[PDB]
Write a protein that binds this ligand. Structure first.
Ligand SMILES: [Mg+2]
Ligand SMILES: [Zn+2]
Lengths: 455, 101, 50, 51, 1340
DNA sequence: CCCATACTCTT
DNA sequence: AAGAGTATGGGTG
């Protein structure tokens, strides 16, 4: 039905009408005993019409419409990427779903997500209706419906009560593996964007420059328990492809942890003996000691026994202030040597894997959250920036280029003398340029990686 | 091509009937009553027709009256009224006594 | 022979555009074949259960 | 239209429990075949499953 | 010397290379093409004249009468562009064509002129192009994109041995006309030539040769060389050419003159050939075995027997030699073929060819073209004749003919549009030569083989397509004899032509809605080149090669700006200086170098011409007199670059921006950015949304003014003069005396565009930038459009930015934004939405637009006027009524209950029902405009009359403004005449001006002059009255609505969007991100003076992306802001003008040999103060894309402003006051707000409506639909093992009709349990399969 | 691009 | 008389 009373037509109805017209004409002609030269043509046209109705285009030409588009037949309804199987039976659109743009939540825990309350009000509407009717605020369904439509002050308390422990499913397309859908506990937030934990983005292959995500709500008890026990992000710590951790820190966290665990030759507060990590933190926050100063700290560490009991040992360690500060985050059962170095991405991943293999699942989750928090805090505190003067050019670059150009010129003159072939000259020039590039790279990297300090 | 489903008055009334604590007999009576409602909101048959359409002799007319009274308070108020006077009185019964006239 | 700090001239930038566009086109195209491969792999092992 | 691609006598009523001419209209006449138009008095969703 | 607009704020330029060629008008490609289509051509090569001359004269079958075309003409449009946009109609002109019907008698020499009748007829409407290169179709601006296609002609190619498994290449040739059928020749692994027509069944190559009336002997003579053997009574004595034996080996003893030059088993070398040529060795004795396999050329017969000894193209034998030896024959003709060269291909094609005549070849061609029908001689002959030799079905156009002749080394450029025997023979010979090993194949991606087709050519093609159908209809109708009274008007119908023109201009693939985000979007859209469209390629079948950057793209196609995705490499942008030939090939300008001196001569070269010269780069140093400083300059010669001497250079580039497009030329420090990020930045730059207040970049390239002016979004002075009147909506300029035409009032009026909706639902608003009484010149900017600031493009805002991590809030391209940015509305945008209400006519009665709706309360009708339409300026939200409408529902039967209802509640309630227009849920705004369209013949309501009165007032105002000047001049003349004779002095001015007319002078010429003045005054008044009446008639004209439509009401709502988390921001270097948090002012990092930053960006995103231009831009913006701060501090404490101009002169003089020269000694004190006032928020700077500023100059400018050279300062934490441990890069960057707003993205659904057939939720936010759970999500759930979640997703959430209701009831009851059933789509599938005649059923 | 089937040259 | 090779048509993306 279209505006103005016009009803138009459909392809299937058109094909049926053509078949019916041909059949009626053939019946009338056979009843009157028409000459065979006409009835044979009518029978051929009826056969063509039936063929078009069943599978249009398979036999010779295809019957088209006004816009020269072939009509869709029953086979077109059944098969193809737009057919029943692939569009309506293997996948479908569902209720209780939404989508929006994603931002970063740096404060969240690993099992939590940030959901706008405008989305949550629509998503959990029948739950809110039931809860309103349960505690006497509404006596009928229409009263609760009107109360929710007005968005009164008590419906927000009801919504906060109904979503307290009820996981939701977050999904980002394309879903390449089963880690593309994960379950989270919602936290109601203001705004219109979904907040995502930084440590799950690698599993989603997501970044915060325009990506959108979809959200689904489990309804039955079985679905909620499956979401909690099978699909929660706190259960998806290891990779099903190779068994390695997938919640490893990256970028800012790595930069902060690396910055706080480096040492400097002559830093403020160097050479003092401390009673423990807390004294180191007090000295750093008071401005009395540097993060990179090399000191001696009393450290107590625990190791699991043969039967699995933690036995403690205390000793003086030569370390830095930042390593002692970071040691307060490590759980009991790990050696102190796991932090007494400059920690890069691989070191942090190995530390997380060691924690998971030795202690289990829950300490690993707590450790990962603490690592992310500390990395963000100290990356912010460092003040790391990028400037044009950071890209230092080696001073020998022009000399190397001039030497390569001189070699190219001399070999070109040698070729012009007729001593070598064209391909040999081409290969020699390429080799000369490759050697010059390697020399320039080595000089630049040798200049960049070291600095001079006063003892 | 395909269109979309539309909600009519009877669809809304049956949606409200679904979420109302009726019994099976009351639910069947409500189904018949909603079936007997036109697009202006008035009842088109006497309650005798509904009682006969229920199909059992264990049900009296006062149960049908009670179910009809419960239905008449659905949204919109005054729906399934017997006549104009009934609709006006049902609409008035939802007003507070502080109304001047 | 130049880096991004000192800047390129017209000819060097025009030369680099070839590789840039080739890489972008390959990235834009290969996903369609990757999807077909994973569809076939899912089709062949759909019903294998422990 | 009668005997057409949307005929109510073949495929079913276009309204719930109402025949085409309009003699039988309510649930008390369910399962009745009208002698004037030939339309059964039943649900209009049977037009999804009658060939 | 600077213009008035530019002298208000001069941008400092760091360019160092002088410009010898101005940037051309950026929309020439559209305007020139349409002008060529529309203009009058004395010849018949372009436009409508060419199409008319290609169809007319039309002659009947008998020839007793005919139609001829004389000339055409275009009438004036009924409405203007603005009027068409308001009324929603098409801006077009009528076509008036003069035809002449001539009648011929019978039984007379030649054709007697019995009667000639000439008539001018109407051929329909032709849309016109505006001044900005657009078309207004149905009240909307549209753009037609140019097409890049393959040029007509002949092309030689070869598959690279991929088809065959032996690694052998197969050469082929293809002939493609502009209009006709393709003709393909190809080789096979058996070295047999074959021919294809219209990509159909393969045929032997000799079928076409025989169809051209050729015999085997003639074909052999054409494609081979003759060898003559003479029987000199002794073993076939032979005359030998030495060159014949090259590369072969002697099979016998070759001796001559008693000397054996070559022995048996010895191959023939070059020395032997030279010796034979020196000795002129002709006579050679050969054995009989030497003729054991030679091919005979012609047919031989025996005189005695009279039979045929042998047929042509046959191998010989000893018995045949014996037969011819005894038959008295002394001359034998053979063919010269071998293996290395001159390979036999035509002979083998003849051998495989079954035909041996001329009539059967036509039969076979007819059978190949049309199978399943008996062959007819006449039918086959006509088919072959019309296939390639008919001017009515085959056309090899002028460009096609030129390419065809050039590809065969011809000399004539012009020729005929049809093929000939010579053309096909030459193509065959060229392909054979390619196969032998001499010559090369063509490069399809070379820009000398690809052609540009613009809107005018496509319009001409469509017009001819309509015209041929019209001609066919006329020829059909002209057979009947009624010529004594027939007229050309009755003979033709103008419907097919108008239909074709409308279809092309409205529904073509290359006709699109104009991109109207900003001026740069429109400029980019109008300069777009597409390889798709009718006659182009498809994205599904393109290939890698066609998507690559070709060396010939240099200066013609931008190698950077292209979409990323499926269409990569298929959509291109024109370069800045690129043009087209007369044939449609892209060309670029170069400077000619004469005797080592670079001159100012400019030559435009195409891709073919460019490859034959050595061309130097624009980055080459020159002396004062124009000499290369060095002696080894870098140049490109033949698709490759290397060093050349100073005297080997022929041409030089004209500019350093000759390679990039307009969008890429607007990126500063482009040479420091990677190409991928440059592409991303160019793509994102043209989707920025204009803000409330424009802000110039403060770090630019120098191309902002050209983009701002050439886009047409601003108001530009047509003539110079003085600003007589200025206002927020109109500007009146008093034109200079010497720029005025005789007899006119010298004023120009500009009405500005105020708060108008664009195609992307944004705001179009113009604001004046001139003051009362100031001088203007032709070309100056009078008013700024959207995203324009004092005549410069202004797409974003200047932001104070720092590069540091901040507690994880800029993790993975997140952006932290200060609250001060939000409080100042620096990224707030205006969005305008349109709603429509249509009142139609029904059978029960017409619908009525009224304010009296019976079933709604008084409060809900409070915002409607007396006509039932909302007021201007009302604040509305979802559910409010905009237009009140009722629909009839009356019936002729009144039941007692209906009578009671009518008696108690009135008759109006029982007759009509509400059908009003309401605000959609989730929409809010302010009513800013209402339009009413009424069908001609229907009475107008109060609102329409008010609108028409408002429209009439403005025209009255303009006409009065002109009349005042004219009548003041006339009355000044009257007073001057009165003074000279009979002067009354003060008494004259005591009386009003009209009383001056009621005076008389002496009987001399004074009275005659007074009468003349009075007559002129009366004529002027009459003329202006006529003008006003015509304007009123145009305003009050009725509307032409769709059938059954009574009235239409359109309402416009305006809303303001603020910045919030989830909005997308970007720079110009490909650095995009999403806002994550709005931070309070005291939490931001700040410097020693307590000044916070606006934005915090992550430094981790710079090194891996290699877009270093943003860091340099930040440093330069810091320096510019420092200069501005110096100027502002100098202005705050009132100081002398001398100190200000001294400091500003120091600022402008900075640099290392810059071409710009600014002298403030020619500025007045007022001009200096105005310039200083415009510079107090930062000095704008320009850096061209390859001639920009160096780091040393940036450090010098930082020093001038008393700023650190490193570009880094110390910051303090807002929350604690503690200093950060390392210096931080802090500066200014130009940021843009993109059109991906989170308000348009967020969507959620609990339940809603479903499809009627599948019973599944709909899709889309507009339909309140749900999200799709596809196959991959199902796979993920299966891999988890969550069976209940999958089943719940599959049944009770999508299409289990009873399950949905039961689940909803259970959830409301607090019982979380489902009762799954059968999906309805499976039942639909079962019914569909049963409808195919297959019995499928469920069992048990 | 890759595979299945009908038609043609060869041992 | 079989058997290997080539051309054509169907399906997928
Ligand atoms: Mg992204
Ligand atoms: Zn009936």
């Amino acid at each position: 039905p279209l505006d103005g009373g016009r009803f138009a037509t459909s392809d299937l109805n058109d094909l049926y009408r053509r078949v019916i017209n041909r059949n009626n004409r053939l019946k009338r002609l056979l009843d009157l005993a028409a000459p065979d030269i006409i009835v044979r043509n009518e029978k051929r046209m009826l056969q063509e019409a039936v063929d078009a109705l069943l599978d249009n285009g398979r036999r010779g030409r295809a019957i088209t419409g006004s816009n020269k588009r072939p009509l869709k037949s029953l086979a077109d309804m059944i098969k193809g990427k737009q057919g029943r199987f692939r569009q309506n039976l293997l996948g479908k659109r569902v209720d209780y779903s939404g989508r929006s743009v994603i931002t970063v939540g740096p404060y969240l825990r690993l099992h939590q997500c940030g959901l706008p309350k405008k989305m949550a009000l629509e998503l959990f509407k029948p739950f809110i209706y039931g809860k309103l009717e349960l505690r006497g605020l509404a006596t009928t369904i229409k009263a609760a419906k009107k109360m929710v439509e007005r968005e009164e002050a008590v419906v927000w308390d009801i919504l906060d009560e109904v979503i307290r422990e009820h996981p939701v499913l977050l999904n980002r397309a394309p879903t390449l593996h089963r880690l593309g859908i994960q379950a989270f506990e919602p936290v109601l937030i203001e705004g219109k964007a979904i907040q995502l934990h930084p440590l799950v983005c690698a599993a989603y292959n997501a970044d915060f420059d325009g990506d959108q995500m979809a959200v689904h709500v489990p309804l039955t008890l079985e679905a909620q328990l499956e979401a909690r026990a099978l699909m929660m992000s706190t259960n998806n710590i290891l990779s099903p492809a190779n068994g390695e951790p997938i919640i490893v820190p990256s970028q800012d966290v790595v930069l902060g942890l690396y910055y706080m665990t480096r040492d400097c030759v002559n830093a403020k507060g160097e050479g003092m003996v401390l009673t423990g990590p807390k004294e180191a933190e007090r000295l750093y926050r008071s401005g009395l000691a540097s993060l990179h100063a090399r000191v001696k700290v009393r450290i107590t560490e625990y190791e699991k026994d043969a039967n699995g009991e933690l036995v403690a040992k205390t000793s003086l360690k030569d370390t830095t202030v930042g390593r002692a500060i970071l040691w307060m985050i490590v759980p009991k059962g790990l050696p102190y040597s796991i932090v007494n170095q400059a920690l890069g991405k691989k070191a942090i991943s190995k530390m997380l894997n060691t924690c998971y293999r030795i202690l289990g699942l829950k300490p690993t989750v707590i450790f990962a959250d603490q690592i992310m928090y500390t990395g963000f805090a100290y990356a912010a505190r460092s003040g790391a920036s990028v400037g044009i003067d950071d890209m230092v050019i080696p001073e020998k670059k022009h000399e190397i280029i001039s030497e390569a150009e001189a070699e190219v010129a001399e070999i070109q003159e040698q070729f012009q003398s007729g001593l070598v072939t064209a391909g040999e000259r081409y290969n020699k020039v390429i080799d000369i340029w490759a050697a010059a590039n390697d020399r320039v790279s080595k000089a630049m990297m040798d200049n960049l990686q070291t600095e001079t300090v006063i003892n | 091509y395909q269109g979309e489903t539309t909600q009519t008055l009877q669809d809304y009334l049956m949606w409200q009937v679904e979420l109302t604590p009726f019994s099976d007999t009351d639910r069947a009576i409500a189904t018949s009553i909603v079936d007997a409602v036109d697009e202006t909101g008035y009842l088109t048959v006497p309650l005798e027709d509904i009682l006969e359409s229920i199909g059992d002799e264990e049900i009296d007319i006062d149960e049908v009256e009670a179910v009809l009274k419960r239905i008449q308070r659905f949204d919109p108020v005054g729906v399934a009224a017997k006549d104009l006077r009934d609709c006006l009185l049902i609409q008035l019964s939802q007003f507070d006594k502080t109304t001047p006239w | 022979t130049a880096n991004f700090r000192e800047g390129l001239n017209v000819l060097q930038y025009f030369i680099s555009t070839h590789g840039a566009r080739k890489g972008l086109a390959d990235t834009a195209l290969k996903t369609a074949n990757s999807g077909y491969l994973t569809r076939r792999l899912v089709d062949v092992a759909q019903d294998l259960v422990v | 239209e009668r005997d057409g691609l949307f005929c109510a006598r073949i495929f079913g009523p276009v309204k719930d429990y109402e025949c085409l001419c309009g003699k039988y209209k309510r649930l008390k006449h369910r399962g009745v075949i009208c002698e004037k138009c030939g339309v059964e008095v039943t649900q209009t969703k049977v037009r999804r499953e009658r060939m | 010397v600077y213009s008035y607009t530019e002298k208000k704020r001069i941008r400092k330029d760091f360019g160092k290379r002088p410009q010898v060629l101005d940037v051309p008008y950026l929309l020439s490609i559209q305007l020139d093409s349409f002008q060529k289509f529309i203009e009058q051509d004395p010849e018949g090569q372009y436009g409508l004249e060419a199409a008319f001359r290609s169809v007319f004269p039309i002659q009947s079958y008998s020839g007793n009468s005919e139609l001829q075309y004389v000339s055409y003409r275009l009438g004036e449009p009924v409405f203007d562009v603005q009027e068409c946009q308001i009324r929603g109609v098409t801006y077009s002109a009528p076509l008036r064509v003069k035809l002449r019907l001539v009648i011929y008698e019978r039984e007379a020499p030649e054709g007697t002129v019995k009667d000639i009748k000439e008539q001018e007829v109407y051929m329909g409407e032709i849309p016109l192009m505006t001044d900005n290169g657009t078309f207004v179709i149905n009240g909307t601006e549209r753009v037609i994109v140019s097409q890049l296609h393959r040029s007509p002609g002949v092309f030689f190619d070869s598959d690279k041995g991929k088809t065959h498994s032996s690694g052998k290449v197969l050469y082929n040739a293809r002939i493609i006309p502009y209009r006709g059928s393709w003709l393909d020749f190809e080789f096979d692994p058996k070295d047999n030539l074959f021919v294809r027509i219209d990509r159909r069944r393969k045929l032997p190559a000799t079928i076409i040769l025989r169809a051209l009336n050729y015999t085997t002997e003639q074909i052999l003579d054409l494609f081979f060389e003759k060898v003559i053997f003479e029987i000199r009574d002794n073993k076939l004595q032979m005359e030998l050419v030495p060159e014949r034996l090259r590369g072969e080996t002697a099979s016998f003893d070759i001796e001559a003159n008693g000397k054996v030059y070559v022995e048996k088993g010895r191959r023939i070398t070059a020395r032997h050939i030279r010796q034979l040529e020196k000795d002129d060795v002709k006579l050679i004795e050969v054995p009989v075995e030497y003729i054991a396999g030679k091919v005979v050329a012609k047919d031989y017969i025996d005189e005695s027997t009279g039979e045929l000894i042998c047929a042509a193209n046959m191998e010989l034998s000893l018995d045949l030699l014996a037969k011819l030896s005894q038959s008295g024959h002394k001359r034998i003709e053979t063919l010269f073929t071998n293996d290395l060269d001159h390979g036999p291909y035509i002979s083998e094609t003849l051998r495989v060819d079954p035909t041996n005549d001329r009539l059967s070849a036509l039969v076979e061609i007819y059978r190949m073209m049309r199978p399943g029908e008996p062959p007819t001689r006449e039918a086959a002959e006509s088919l072959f004749e019309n296939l390639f030799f008919s001017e009515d079905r085959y056309d090899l156009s002028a460009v096609g003919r030129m390419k065809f002749n050039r590809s065969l080394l011809r000399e004539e450029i012009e020729g005929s549009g049809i093929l000939s025997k010579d053309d096909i023979i030459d193509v065959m010979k060229k392909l054979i030569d390619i196969r032998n090993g001499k010559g090369e194949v063509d490069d399809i991606d070379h820009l000398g083989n690809r052609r540009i087709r613009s809107v005018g050519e496509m319009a001409e093609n469509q017009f001819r397509v309509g015209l041929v159908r019209v001609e066919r209809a006329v020829k059909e109708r002209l057979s009947l004899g009624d010529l004594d009274t027939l007229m050309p008007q009755d003979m033709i119908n103008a419907k097919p032509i108008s239909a074709a023109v409308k279809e092309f201009f409205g529904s073509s693939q290359l006709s699109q809605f104009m991109d109207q985000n900003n001026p740069l979007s429109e400029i980019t859209h109008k300069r777009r080149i597409s390889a798709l469209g009718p006659g182009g390629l498809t994205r599904e079948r393109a290939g890698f090669e066609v998507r690559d950057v070709h060396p010939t793209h240099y200066g013609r196609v931008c190698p950077i700006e292209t979409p990323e995705g499926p269409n990569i490499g298929l959509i291109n942008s024109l370069s800045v200086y690129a043009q087209t030939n007369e044939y449609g090939f892209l060309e670029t300008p170069y400077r000619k170098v004469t005797d080592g001196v670079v001159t100012d001569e400019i030559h435009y070269l195409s891709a073919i011409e460019e490859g034959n010269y050595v061309i130097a780069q624009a980055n080459s140093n020159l002396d004062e007199e124009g000499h290369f400083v060095e002696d080894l300059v870098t140049c490109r010669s033949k698709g490759e670059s290397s060093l050349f001497s100073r005297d080997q250079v022929d041409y030089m580039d004209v500019s350093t921006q000759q390679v990039v497009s307009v969008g890429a030329s607007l990126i500063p420090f482009l040479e420091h950015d990677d190409a991928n990020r440059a592409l991303m930045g160019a793509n994102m730059q043209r989707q920025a949304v204009p803000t409330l207040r424009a802000d110039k970049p403060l770090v630019g390239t120098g191309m902002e003014r050209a983009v701002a002016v050439d886009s047409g979004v601003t108001a530009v002075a047509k003539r110079g003069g003085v600003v007589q009147y200025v206002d927020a909506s109109r500007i009146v300029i008093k034109v200079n005396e010497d720029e005025m035409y005789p007899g006119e009032a010298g004023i120009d009026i500009y009405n500005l565009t105020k708060y108008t909706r664009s195609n992307q639902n944004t705001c179009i608003n113009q604001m004046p930038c001139v003051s009362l009484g100031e001088p203007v010149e032709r070309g100056d900017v009078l008013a700024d459009g959207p995203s324009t600031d004092l005549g410069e493009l202004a797409l974003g805002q200047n932001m104070r930015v720092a590069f540091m991590p901040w507690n994880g809030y800029n993790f993975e391209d997140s952006i932290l934004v200060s609250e001060r940015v939000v409080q100042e509305d620096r990224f707030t945008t205006i969005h305008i939405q349109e709603l429509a209400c249509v009142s139609r006519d029904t059978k029960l009665g017409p619908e009525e637009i009224t304010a009296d709706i019976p079933n709604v309360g008084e409060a809900a009708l409070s915002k409607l006027d007396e006509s039932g339409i909302v007021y201007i300026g009302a604040e509305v939200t979802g559910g409010d009524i905009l237009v009140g409408k009722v629909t009839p529902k009356g019936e002729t039967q009144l039941t007692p209950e209906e009578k009671l209802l009518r008696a108690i509640f009135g008759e109006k309630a029982s007759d009509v029902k509400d059908s009003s227009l309401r605000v959609p849920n989730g929409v809010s705004g302010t009513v800013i405009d209402v339009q009413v369209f009424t069908r001609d013949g229907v009475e107008k309501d109060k609102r329409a009359l008010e609108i028409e009165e408002m429209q009439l007032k403005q025209a009255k105002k303009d006409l009065s403004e002109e009349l005042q000047i004219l009548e003041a001049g006339l009355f000044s003349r009257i007073r001057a005449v009165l003074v000279a004779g009979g002067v009354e002095a003060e008494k004259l001015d005591k009386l009003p001006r009209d009383r001056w007319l009621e005076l008389g002078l002496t009987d001399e010429e004074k009275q005659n002059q007074l009468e003349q003045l009075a007559e002129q005054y009366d004529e002027l008044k009459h003329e202006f009255e006529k003008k006003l009446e015509a304007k009123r008639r145009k305003i009050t004209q009725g509307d032409d609505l769709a059938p059954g439509v009574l009235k239409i009401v359109k309402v416009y709502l305006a809303v303001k969007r603020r910045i919030q988390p989830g909005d997308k921001m970007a720079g110009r270097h490909g650095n995009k991100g999403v806002i994550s948090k709005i931070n309070p002012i005291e939490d931001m990092p700040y410097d020693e003076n307590g000044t916070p930053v606006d934005i915090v960006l992550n430094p981790l995103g710079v090194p891996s992306r290699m877009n270093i231009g943003q860091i340099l831009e930040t440093h330069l913006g810091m320096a510019a802001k420092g200069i501005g701060d110096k100027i502002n501090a100098m202005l705050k404490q009132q100081q002398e003008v001398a100190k200000l101009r001294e400091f500003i002169q120091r600022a402008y003089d900075l640099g290392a040999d810059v071409r710009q020269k600014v002298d403030l000694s020619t500025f007045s004190d007022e001009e200096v103060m105005r310039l200083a006032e415009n510079l107090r928020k930062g000095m704008p700077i320009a850096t061209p894309v390859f001639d920009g500023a160096k780091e040393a100059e940036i450090k010098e400018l930082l020093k001038l402003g008393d700023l650190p050279t490193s570009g880094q300062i110390r910051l303090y934490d807002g929350r604690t006051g503690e200093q950060f441990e390392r210096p931080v890069t802090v500066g200014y960057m130009y940021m843009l707000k993109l059109n991906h707003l989170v308000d348009d993205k967020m969507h959620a659904r609990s339940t809603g409506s479903y499809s009627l057939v599948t019973q599944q939720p709909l899709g889309g936010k507009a339909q309140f639909g749900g999200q799709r759970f596809g196959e991959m999500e199902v796979w993920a759930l299966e891999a988890y093992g969550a069976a209940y979640t999958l089943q719940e997703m599959l049944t009770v959430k999508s299409d289990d009709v009873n399950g949905r209701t039961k689940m909803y009831k259970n959830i409301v009851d607090g019982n979380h349990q489902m009762e799954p059933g059968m999906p309805e789509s499976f039942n639909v599938l079962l019914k569909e399969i049963r409808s195919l005649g297959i019995n499928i059923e469920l069992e048990d």
